[PDB]
């Protein structure tokens, strides 16, 4: 039914592997989360790849927002529609002393946005938070409705399987 099969299911969370175009095309979701920074300056990782997908519309709209009242608290998400695609720009934390308390806030913003999210594991790339830590918060917060999670590299895939195995 859904084009791309999940590699793993845990409780109400389903895990997928691909780049942006693969997951946007292959996964059934109401909105995709972007692991953004407080500037909504999409320079790297998933943020760049989502911007490229939208052919710059995302960055253009981000600038607009960033912008109006005013710029963006760690997070705290900003929904934008780029044609069919709804992108929920959520400011995950940088690694640091409050990382857990802020991952909690970010995942809660995600879990409380209406619809089935497709989300990355926040902060686990350029922000340098341990994948398993961020994932642990994700699962703790997102404990009711169906939520879909994507990762990118085969390394991250093994990390998810292994962590979920420990549960
Ligand atoms: N081309 C891609 N397609 C799909 N997923 C990707 C891609 N590139 C990176 N990802 C990543 O998305 C997830 C989160 O990684 P990052 O994008 O590095 O996000 P984060 O660690 O939250 O750091 C955010 C920072 O990086 C961006 O430049 C963004 O503007 C912000 O400054 C990771 O699971 C996964 O490796």
UniProtKB/Swiss-Prot annotation:
Membrane topology (UniProt): Multi-pass membrane protein
* Subcellular location(s) of the protein: Host membrane
> What region holds the Macro domain?
1-167
| Descriptive protein name | Non-structural protein 3
Q: What is the lineage of its organism?
A: Viruses, Riboviria, Orthornavirae, Pisuviricota, Pisoniviricetes
Full-length numbering of the shown residues:
1269 to 1435 of 4085
């Amino acid at each position: 039914k859904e084009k791309l099969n999940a590699f793993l299911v845990h409780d109400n969370v389903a895990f997928y592997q691909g780049d942006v175009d693969t997951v946007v095309n292959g996964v059934d979701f109401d909105f995709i989360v972007n692991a953004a920074n407080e500037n909504l300056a999409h320079g790297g990782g998933l943020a760049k790849a989502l911007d490229v997908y939208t052919k710059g519309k995302l960055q253009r709209l981000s600038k607009e927002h960033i912008g109006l009242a005013g710029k963006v608290k760690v997070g705290t998400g900003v929904m934008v529609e780029c044609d069919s695609l709804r992108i929920f720009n959520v400011v995950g934390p940088r690694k640091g002393k409050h990382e857990r308390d802020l991952l909690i806030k970010a995942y809660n913003t995600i879990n409380n946005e209406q619809g089935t999210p497709l989300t990355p594991i926040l902060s686990c790339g350029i922000f340098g938070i341990k994948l398993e830590t961020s994932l642990e918060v994700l699962l703790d917060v997102c404990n009711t409705k169906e939520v879909k999670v994507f990762v990118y590299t085969d390394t991250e895939v093994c990390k998810v399987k292994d962590f979920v195995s420990g549960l």
